[PDB]
Nucleic acid binder design. Structure first.
Lengths: 101, 73, 173, 119, 88
RNA sequence: GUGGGAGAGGGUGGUGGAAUUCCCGGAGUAGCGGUGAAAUGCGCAGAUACCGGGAGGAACGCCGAUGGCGAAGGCAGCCACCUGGUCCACCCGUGACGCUGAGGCGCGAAAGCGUGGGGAGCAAACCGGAUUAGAUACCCGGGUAGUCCACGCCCUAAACGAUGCGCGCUAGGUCUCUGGGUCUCCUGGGGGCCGAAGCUAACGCGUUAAGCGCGCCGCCUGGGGAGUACGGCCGCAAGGC
């Protein structure tokens, strides 16, 4: 398969039970689709550099994860789905590049 | 010319690969928040190109305002 | 053949698998006979797509699974619906054929915003309902009526016009 | 008969008249003036001088409802934008500060002949 | 897309002599593979003109190759031919 | 083959803020817009400025460049799905398999057409204003088609390098992109600048040839009429060949 990093953001105004049920659907999905999680960060929340969700802050989640090429898009939408899905961004996973070396 | 600041020698082993490099990218913002030119970045083609790509992924997921009010003036 | 059938699901949880293509002759609507849990079926609302391959439903919960329904309550903003239920459950309240349907183009309090297919915009109420996705009318327009008058074929009103009659004659004419 | 002590002053100016107006310390309007607001017809409205006459009376009134402390907003290039905003600091009036906004798009709206010739 | 391992499964399949990294057996197998997948593509995406075109030059190469073959020994030409399935 | 690589080549879907008009609330005056200077036109039913919010189509700033990719025309928010070209190292595989191409085949600006969506803004036409002698146009104020998408359909052009494609021969200096290296500079590919030779009526071209040589294609032979008339074929038509 191919791996990409998943970066998607869910609302700040989402209290507990919400963080819960929604991130939970999330995971469900990913899997359902065909993603084998590899690394889940969660820098939590931040003042986005520009109001978004009329929100000056939000909850950002990133999972280095892979899956079956083509189906990318499809799951992307599966996500965006849930309103709250403030943002849905996916990116092929190339490692790094040391400039100023 | 444009040699009073210069940005290359402000960042060591620099991975032009983690869009989430907030505080580093936040380090090419100037004020109304443009994209400070080679004329400043001390960056190559390889540079503005890749660097930019992220710059872009960056505004995308946000966390860097793609321009934003200039104080004083 | 000269009959109607359904237009409002309200016993949920019941799996509703898209039985089949029974594209239908009675209201610009192709429909599928829907197959419910119990065997209980329903020649149900066209909604373009959800393939022969029986496979959805709707309900209290949700599953914005295109096609399918629920209250506008349990409803995503930016969604195309039909099954257009205006008042708290009066069967569907619009888009029949009506391809473009209504858009949860924003919703507020016990009132939800419908870009009103037919051509304007305003709101419905709470738990009210709708099912989204497509209608199924294949352009369901044009088609020829060449050498003869498809009309007359219409069986549908060769209620022919007039309006210029040498007369005294009819209601605003 | 509103009185505030502080807020912002807005300067906007074409190259065919200028305008200036008081805004509360948020954004809602106070009182203003501009080119023809100063007996100036056709042209004139388009002079650094004007820039001033106005900027000035502007403040005066600005004072009327006890106003003095002001930060300033910038829109466009006013052919005298300076005799102007300067006139502004001169009428003392807590010449707090200025900010840069003259907000150009991002490139998505063709203009009229006069503005085309771009590329 | 065409996967390396498969590509080899290929080259291999063909080679009269397991070391035919480049011969017409492979030019052939190859080119045609590309051919099919490519077209398939073309159909949906009904308007990939640039691409189609290239594809085209390609059908071209495929051919000139076969060509040569027949030219030399239409024998394994017929052989291959059949194997692959081109011409009908 | 394989291993490295670079791009606005392509198409499919997908979001994203900048600003832009109109919509609803706030607040607040008497002006606004505008030009060579006006006026036409808007505005006390309060506009223009500013505060927020809304709806929406279009485009895509900085980075971005004398930079890049592409057969040609062309092509730049980001994102993933399928796809094309092509470049440098290994020297590994094949074994001259080749280069030109009449007809043909497809591609293919912008206008325009066909239909089915959209249509913020810009905009022949059409409307005012202004103008001068005259104003059917330069200037200002209005606004349709079209400009935008899907689909089908027209293929035109200073379609430019005004200059077919292939290889091979002939000082150099320089800048720059991209790929390899013993990485003070050499090496392959790409782009601009200056430049011997040499070509050239002339300018000017100058290993990105308008130098020297081989194949193959095309197209030339005084101006107007003229790229037209007519025959033919093409197209919804406008027209086209």
């Amino acid at each position: 398969m191919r791996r990409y990093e998943v970066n998607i953001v869910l609302n700040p105004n989402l209290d507990q039970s919400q963080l819960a049920l929604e991130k939970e659907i999330i995971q469900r999905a990913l899997e359902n689709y065909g993603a084998r999680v590899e690394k889940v960060e969660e820098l939590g929340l931040r003042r986005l550099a520009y109001p978004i969700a009329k929100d000056p802050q939000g909850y950002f989640l990133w999972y280095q994860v892979e899956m079956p090429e083509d189906r990318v898009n499809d799951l992307a939408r599966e996500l965006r789905i849930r309103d709250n899905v403030r943002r849905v961004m996916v990116v092929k996973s190339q490692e790094p590049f040391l400039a100023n070396a | 010319p444009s040699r009073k600041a210069k940005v290359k020698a402000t960042l060591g082993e620099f991975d032009l690969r983690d869009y989430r490099n907030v505080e580093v990218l936040k380090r090419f913002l100037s004020e109304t928040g443009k994209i400070l030119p080679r004329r400043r970045t001390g960056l190559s083609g390889k540079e503005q190109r890749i660097l930019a790509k992220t710059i872009k992924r960056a505004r995308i997921l946000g966390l860097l305002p793609f321009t934003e009010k200039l104080v004083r003036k | 053949q000269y009959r109607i059938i359904d237009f409002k699901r309200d016993k949920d949880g019941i799996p509703g698998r898209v039985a089949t293509i029974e594209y239908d002759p009675n209201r610009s609507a192709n429909i599928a006979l829907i197959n419910y849990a119990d065997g209980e079926k329903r020649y149900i609302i066209a909604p373009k797509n959800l393939k022969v391959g029986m496979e959805i439903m709707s309900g209290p919960d949700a599953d914005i699974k295109i096609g399918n329904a629920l209250p506008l309550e349990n409803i995503p903003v930016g969604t195309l619906v039909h099954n257009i239920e205006l008042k708290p459950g009066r069967g569907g309240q619009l888009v029949r054929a009506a391809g473009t349907s209504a858009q949860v183009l924003g919703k507020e309090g016990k009132y939800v915003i419908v870009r009103l297919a037919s051509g304007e915009v305003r709101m419905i109420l709470g738990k009210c309902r709708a099912t989204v996705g497509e209608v199924g009318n294949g352009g369901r327009t044009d088609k020829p009526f060449v050498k003869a008058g498809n009309k007359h074929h219409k069986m549908k009103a060769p209620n022919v016009r007039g309006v210029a009659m040498n007369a005294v004659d009819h209601p605003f004419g | 008969k509103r009185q505030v002590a502080s807020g912002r002053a807005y300067i906007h100016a074409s190259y065919n008249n200028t305008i200036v107006t008081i805004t509360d310390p948020d954004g809602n309007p106070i009182t203003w003036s501009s080119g023809g607001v100063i007996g100036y017809k056709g042209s004139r409205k388009g002079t650094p001088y004007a820039a001033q006459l106005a900027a000035l009376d502007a403040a005066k009134k600005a004072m009327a409802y006890g106003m003095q402390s002001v930060d300033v907003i910038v829109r466009g290039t006013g052919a005298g934008r300076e005799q102007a905003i300067r006139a502004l600091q001169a009428s003392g009036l807590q010449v707090k500060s200025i900010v840069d906004d003259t907000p150009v798009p991002h490139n998505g709206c063709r203009p009229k002949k006069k503005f085309r010739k771009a590329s | 897309p065409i996967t390396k391992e498969e590509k080899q499964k290929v080259i291999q399949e063909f080679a009269r002599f397991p070391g035919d990294t480049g011969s017409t057996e492979v030019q052939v197998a190859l080119l045609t593979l590309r051919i099919n997948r490519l077209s398939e593509h073309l159909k949906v995406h009904k308007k990939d003109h640039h691409s189609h075109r290239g594809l085209l030059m390609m059908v071209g190469q495929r051919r000139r190759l076969l060509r040569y073959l027949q030219r030399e020994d239409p024998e394994r030409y017929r052989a291959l031919i059949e194997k692959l399935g081109i011409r009908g």
